[PDB]
Amino acid sequence: GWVPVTKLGRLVKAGKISSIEEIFLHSLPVKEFQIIDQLLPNLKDEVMNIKPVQKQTRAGQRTRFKAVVVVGDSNGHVGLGIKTAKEVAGAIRAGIIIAKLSVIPIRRGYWGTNLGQPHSLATKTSGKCGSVSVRLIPAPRGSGIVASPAVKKLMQLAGVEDVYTSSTGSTRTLENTLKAAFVAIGNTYGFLTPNLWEVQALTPSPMDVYADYATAS
RNA sequence: CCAGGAUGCCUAGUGGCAGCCCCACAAUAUCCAGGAAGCCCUCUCUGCGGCUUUUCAGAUUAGGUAGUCGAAAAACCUUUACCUGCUAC
């Protein structure tokens, strides 16, 4: 049971978009969820927490469940998904889906000197959500994920192997903290370096190129 | 709770089948505006609700606190107010 809406989805189904890298390059929206799955088979989905959450009513209260989910692998991709529904499993599923939709790349750079493969962040990057500022400072090697538990988990999911944090403001608003972390991660690709001064060609997108295969008949 | 005594226009009425034969409408004042039962009240013929109580309890309820109700001897004519009770795959 597949069947896509979204030109992009159709393209993916056809098999002309190879990896999510291309998508990232052409900042293409992924409203459908299955595409991500197709691209990346190694999605580890981990539920961070579930707040019960209550609207107050003329009689009693409306218990729903704000399930927070973090999704990753070890390649340099993460997703953060928040949903609040009444059935818990359903809510969790929704959260997972959201995370998948989000899934966003991470620029993993070098501590200091290249030598081996990169598993820290490139630059000192930070995020913000409400009153949580998660600041991720790049570590040295072997020094680990120095972070709040949730944050650490997120880092692990991403495939950041070593990193320092400085989570400030009310970190115990766990969801908020997670969001902040995600934002910070995103900011990695966005922070210009002297490595990317050099000018790129601007490639044509798959949406432009494979336009006949995309869209309905 | 009470009633009219008389200075008077009253007026021998006007209406509706006046006709005597019933209906309704028309006669200022009134001088008194006065009498009877009840009348602020205090001792009696010396009443039944107080005085404490001690016994308990009915209970009052979701639980409890403080009061209140019921059966036994001594002068005097409310069953309510208020505290304390519950959470994820």
CB of A175 nearer than 7 A to strand B = no
CB of A89 nearer than 7 A to strand B = yes
In angstroms, the CA A215 to CA A4 distance is: 10
Q: How far is the CA of A182 from the C1' of B17 (A)?
A: 113
Q: Residue A168 — left, alpha, or beta (φ > 0 → left; ψ -120 to 50 → alpha)?
A: beta
At residue A73's C-alpha, the angle toward residues A72 and A75, to 5°, is: 115
CB of A65 nearer than 7 A to strand B = yes
Q: How far is the CA of A20 from the C1' of B18 (A)?
A: 123
Structure-determination approach: cryo-EM
In angstroms, the CA A81 to CA A27 distance is: 19
Is A80 assigned to a binding site? Answer: yes
In angstroms, the CA A183 to CA A40 distance is: 21
User: Which residue is it, tokens 């009153």?
Assistant: A131
In angstroms, the CA A78 to CA A43 distance is: 9
Q: Residue A113 — left, alpha, or beta (φ > 0 → left; ψ -120 to 50 → alpha)?
A: left
CB within 8 Å of A217: residues ≥ 6 apart? none
A149-158 vs A174-188: helix axis angle to the nearest 10? 40
Domains of chain A are 1-105 (3.30.160.20), 106-199 (3.30.230.10)
Q: Which residues of A82-107 are buried (b: 16+ CB within 10 A; e: fewer)?
A: bbbbeeeeebbbbbbbbbbbbbbbbb
